[PDB]
């Protein structure tokens, strides 16, 4: 190109014309991929409005039985093809997957499709498209991305399942030579995931924030049909929610069950095999006729007849700050060891007492909590923002602590770890959301906890403006959003966090297997040597390395 440009079009003018485009702008004679852009992104891309357009390749997956695997579709238009409002809607069909046997993944129940919507000008929203055709506007200079997730069945046969993903552009069956073909191809193999998690990730719903924005007195019948809605979406995320009120110092009331014990609905709830930890409410909750002395009895002698009592826990209090608090948490303890003294008591802390310190410095007196309160907590569940990036303090925690009598230790994560920390801040990238479970992994923990995942400023109608809480960073607290933000369901939204949880969680999944097959330094040097995970500020930015672990495994650890 020369110093005037081709033509004398001036400055830079012709660097690749970029293929001449076609006169015609009509999608009735001129092949849509002539029109629009249309390429694949990995699963851990937040596929912002201005991303640039690739080629498109065949698409090459591999998932377990019980595993979902995802995958996104780019859009940006080219040209106007509906000159008057552009640039003109396309349309979208999926197909069912088939292997060589002719075993089948179908539209509708596995495979599933949903629009990328951005919150706080962040891709977050994942929207429902209507099954198996759909259609989307696509609006110029602004590329429109569409989230693909297949879920395999725990019985699924094993093979190599394959399809197509056809766009056409439309104008304002309509397949044709003219249509897009995405070629998509996916491996099922041996693993079975477990459909117990073997990592209990157990998250909190605000009950508050249910009854304002849905206005359901608490205790009414249609209360109770709304968090039965909640607790059966979030069991496809290997969760284990609970109910959470919030008290006089920061108690906390907790429950996964808002039935009685008694009710059938209490065991269809805590019998169920995807759901691997619960919490049992200390007071009633529900108001009754009896003392919470006389209720707690009366529960926890079902409970403990019941063969899933070993996924009981009580959560008692949110951060004792002071001595009264650790206080409270010792005398509310054993009021419940005197029902069933192999209770578990799970308590969240960042600190030892403030007004009385346990050593000389914070983190000395932090470390030091178990010796308090010992024996009356049982899961020792600590913020990890207070290991900085200190890997090499796990071992001061741990040292206080007495595995071989049924103490554990847990972490979590809010307002802090940040940046470049993985959390699920909105504006974090997928690779560090997604690493908040190679970190516990790594660590060693037996468990982990999120305060909550519907936590929004208030609001009291279903399909009011999502706002944040003031004093928190966006995304913290918020994993999913209202349905009817963004249709007319009632079913929630999940966001990109809670997508790449669970990715996080079935990553956990591969390393355990991996762990059970070559022993603990084999599979630390495995996530490490691949790229993924090196330390807290120090993980993959890429979804290559991640590819290359997952084959790893799947080579190696095969019947
Ligand atoms: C457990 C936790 N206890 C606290 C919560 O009460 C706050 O709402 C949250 C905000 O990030 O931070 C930590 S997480």
Redesign the pocket.
């Known amino acids: 190109v020369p110093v005037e440009g081709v033509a004398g079009g001036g400055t830079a003018y012709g660097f690749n014309d970029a293929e001449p485009l076609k006169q015609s702008t009509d999608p009735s004679e001129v092949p849509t991929a002539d029109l629009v852009n249309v390429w694949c992104m990995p699963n851990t891309v937040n596929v912002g409005s201005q991303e640039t357009p690739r080629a498109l390749e065949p698409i090459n997956l591999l998932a377990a039985r019980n595993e979902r695997e995802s995958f996104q579709i780019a859009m940006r238009p080219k040209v106007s093809w509906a000159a008057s409002s552009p640039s003109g809607i396309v349309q979208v069909q999926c197909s069912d997957l088939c292997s060589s046997a002719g075993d089948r993944l179908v539209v509708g129940q596995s495979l599933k499709l949903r629009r990328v919507v951005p919150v706080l000008g962040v891709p977050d929203a994942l929207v429902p498209l209507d099954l198996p055709v759909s259609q989307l506007s696509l609006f110029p200079g602004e590329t429109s991305v569409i989230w693909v997730s297949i879920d395999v069945p725990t019985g699924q046969p094993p093979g190599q399942y394959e399809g197509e993903i056809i766009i056409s552009a439309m104008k304002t069956d309509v397949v044709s030579n003219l249509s897009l073909r995405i070629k998509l191809r996916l491996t099922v193999w041996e693993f079975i995931i477990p459909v117990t998690p073997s990592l209990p990730a157990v998250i909190?719903v605000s009950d508050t924030v249910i009854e304002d924005r849905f206005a359901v007195e608490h205790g009414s019948e249609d209360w109770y049909k709304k968090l039965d809605l909640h607790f059966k979406w979030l069991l496809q995320y290997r969760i284990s929610p609970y109910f959470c009120k919030?008290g006089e110092s920061?108690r906390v009331l907790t429950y996964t069950s808002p039935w009685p014990a008694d009710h059938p609905k209490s065991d269809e709830y805590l019998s169920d095999s995807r759901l691997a930890a619960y919490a049992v409410p200390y007071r009633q909750v529900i108001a009754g006729d009896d003392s919470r002395e006389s209720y707690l009895r009366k529960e926890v002698e079902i409970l403990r007849s019941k063969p899933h009592w070993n996924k009981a826990y009580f959560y008692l209090w949110?951060?004792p700050l002071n001595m009264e608090h650790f206080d409270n948490v010792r005398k509310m303890a054993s009021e419940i060891y005197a029902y069933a003294p192999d209770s578990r008591v799970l308590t969240?802390y960042?600190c030892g007492p403030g007004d009385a310190p346990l050593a000389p410095t914070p983190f000395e007196s932090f470390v030091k909590v178990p010796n308090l309160l010992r024996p009356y907590t049982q899961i020792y569940?600590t913020?990890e923002w207070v290991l900085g990036n200190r890997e090499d303090l796990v071992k001061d925690i741990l040292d206080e602590l007495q595995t071989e009598n049924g103490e554990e230790w847990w972490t979590?994560?809010?307002?802090?770890p940040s940046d470049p920390h993985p959390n699920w801040h909105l504006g974090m990238r997928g690779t560090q959301q997604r690493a908040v479970m190679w970190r516990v992994w790594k660590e060693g923990g037996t468990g982990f906890?999120?305060?909550?995942a519907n936590?929004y400023e208030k609001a009291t109608v279903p399909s009011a403006e999502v706002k944040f809480r003031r004093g928190?960073?966006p995304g913290?607290?918020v994993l999913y959003y209202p349905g009817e933000v963004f249709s007319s369901s009632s079913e929630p939204v999940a966001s990109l966090r809670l997508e790449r949880l669970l990715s996080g969680l079935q990553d956990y999944e591969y390393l355990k297997l991996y762990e059970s097959k070559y022993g603990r330094e084999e599979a630390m040097g495995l996530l490490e040597k691949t790229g993924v995970y090196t330390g807290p500020e120090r993980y993959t930015l890429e979804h290559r390395p991640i590819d290359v672990l997952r084959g790893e495994v799947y080579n190696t650890c095969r019947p």
């Open positions: 909190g919030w920061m949110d951060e969240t960042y569940c913020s979590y994560i809010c307002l802090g906890l999120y305060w909550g936590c928190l960073p913290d607290g």
